[PDB]
Design a protein around this ligand. Structure first.
Ligand SMILES: CC(C)(COP(=O)(O)OP(=O)(O)OC[C@H]1O[C@@H](n2cnc3c(N)ncnc32)[C@H](O)[C@@H]1OP(=O)(O)O)[C@@H](O)C(=O)NCCC(=O)NCCSSCCO
Ligand SMILES: CC(C)(COP(=O)(O)OP(=O)(O)OC[C@H]1O[C@@H](n2cnc3c(N)ncnc32)[C@H](O)[C@@H]1OP(=O)(O)O)[C@@H](O)C(=O)NCCC(=O)NCCSSCCO
Lengths: 305, 305
């Protein structure tokens, strides 16, 4: 009685689209792809990520057909397909990075055996020096803190079938970009771009306009704040514990101080960014994975149109 | 030495992509599709619109393949394809409406014989009453003067394979929407949406996100002002001449007054709208037809990626 471009699913419903897709991941390999605080088990990989993987390959061939028509039209000469670009977006601490890692492993282990790369956009973040100069240290993560010009070049270069294309490297440990570090990407079959900012749209063409498929990992804003604070507290004995950690001073905080500090940074930087720039981007993602307070994925929204 | 998602053409180059596409339009039929002030001849239809028509059908099949994958995935039941939506955008008086009419006739006369409809977005303009109430009479044509909610419904409804979907009707003569008038669209093979506003992007999903192909008819902003003023002067003896014309008072203007009036409305309403909302939309169109001062199409920009 009122059409929608979306189709909504239940884990029970989605679970059924797996068909007879092979589970090529061990419980040992899954654990190494897992992020701090993530609750993902093989059952979810089976129940949720397998159908998603199937759907994606179905479309990788169908999309390769499209560029064929434009090629047949322009009447140009291949054997090297157009890379299939996938964008993964989500809030900080919502688990998008884990989702991206699983998705890569799952896709790379497919009969025809593709070359699946994964690049995180934080490598296109301006160096801390440039941020201070632009007065954006307090806005790290916002669309302005990234070198969107460079990011666009990279993706354009890769999808154009460039032989070699490389990107800068970000160190979460040093909270800055690594001097002289490069991530090289040579003609991949599927490139996964993961970032807070990736689904952004605008006046000029943007990276989002070059995606062939996009995932938005969603959760309740109040639940993410919890995951964030939790992770923060747990990093006192892991990352912050390292002397080279930029936030080594946090390691000594007490459960009490830590929760305060964590909440401050959240409502001050991460929350505004989520509400203002990331969330407004959800409507356009191809697939939206809605997570529950327990980190469990129980609802899925697919773009049929 | 720096990739781009576009490919630029010369009329000579583009002219060559026609291959052996049949010219099924008479010089008599072309004239009836022509707009006041337009200089389009069969040569241009042959030289420019024929390759474009070929390219479009190439992609209509390739795109139908894509929805097939999503269908095979969801494992649903067809014989009635997903309508192929084409958006045509451009400034007022740039000729987009003529371009749209030619494109429709050209496409509808193709071997397999498709059902090609054409809807103009001005029918989704709020009635003059609603505009006055919202204080937008001076902003007729801007994105806010349209009922984007209704427009989105319509297109969504049609692409969903709706049996019947209908739209309101706008009268250029009465400068308002016709009471009780409906344009009915029954499961078309290709729906062409033509409007100033169609390529607009935003926070939520928009009509532009549902297009499968888009044309942007471009020209020099200074040349359009000329075409506009010219047309205005010529409408004194055509449209404005009719007693029922909302702008019947303009028919009596002298060449002098008319040019003044025309220029006022231009720099006041149409130009701002062009610069502010329409032009910023060009980068995203699939095909950009650049017209020359003589109304001739001499350059084409295609989105390869
Ligand atoms: C730098 C930036 C923009 C990075 O955004 P991301 O999208 O990468 O954040 P996300 O939550 O997805 O983190 C991705 C990975 O990066 C890890 N990570 C994040 N921050 C740090 C860190 N400081 N040290 C070590 N690892 C970190 C995080 O644990 C994930 O690892 P795994 O999934 O393998 O377990 C963001 O963390 C930031 O700094 N935002 C504003 C300032 C801020 O939040 N400062 C607090 C610093 S201590 S708190 C925990 C990280 O926010
Ligand atoms: C109503 C609106 C938004 C319509 O925008 P459109 O995109 O349809 O304009 P566009 O230039 O593409 O016109 C499309 C057709 O609509 C015709 N047309 C435009 N205005 C009128 C009119 N007032 N009376 C009769 N026909 C008209 C025009 O000649 C085209 O016909 P053909 O291609 O078959 O020869 C626009 O004309 C408008 O009113 N804009 C702001 C106010 C304004 O410009 N007022 C001046 C009124 S007299 S001047 C000539 C039309 O601007």
């Amino acid at each position: 009685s009122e059409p929608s471009p979306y189709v909504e699913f239940d884990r029970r419903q989605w679970r059924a689209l797996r068909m007879s897709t092979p589970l090529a991941l061990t419980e040992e390999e899954l654990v190494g792809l897992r992020g701090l605080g993530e609750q993902i088990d093989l059952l979810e990989v089976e129940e949720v990520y397998l159908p998603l993987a199937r759907l994606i390959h179905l479309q990788v061939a169908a999309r390769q057909r499209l560029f064929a028509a434009t090629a047949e039209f322009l009447g140009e000469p291949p054997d090297r397909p157009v890379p299939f670009i996938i964008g993964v977006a989500g809030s900080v601490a919502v688990g998008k990075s884990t989702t991206a890692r699983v998705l890569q492993a799952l896709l790379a282990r497919w009969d025809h055996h593709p070359r699946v790369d994964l690049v995180t956009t934080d490598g296109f973040l301006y160096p801390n020096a440039e941020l201070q100069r632009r007065n954006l240290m307090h806005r790290k993560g916002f669309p302005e803190s990234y070198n969107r010009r460079a990011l666009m070049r990279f993706v354009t270069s890769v999808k154009s079938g460039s032989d070699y294309a490389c990107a800068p490297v970000y160190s979460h440990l040093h909270y800055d970009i690594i001097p002289g570090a490069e991530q090289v990407v040579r003609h991949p079959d599927i490139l996964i771009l993961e970032g807070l900012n990736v689904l952004q749209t605008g006046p000029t063409l943007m990276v989002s306009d070059l995606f062939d498929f996009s995932l938005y990992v969603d959760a309740r804003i109040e639940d993410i704040e919890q995951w964030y604070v939790s992770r923060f507290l747990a990093m006192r004995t892991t990352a912050f514990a390292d002397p080279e950690s930029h936030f080594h001073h946090y390691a000594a905080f007490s459960d009490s101080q830590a929760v305060v500090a964590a909440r401050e940074i959240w409502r001050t930087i991460n929350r505004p960014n989520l509400v203002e720039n990331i969330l407004p981007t959800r409507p356009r993602a191809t697939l939206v994975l809605r997570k529950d307070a327990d980190h469990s994925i129980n609802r899925l929204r697919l773009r049929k149109l």
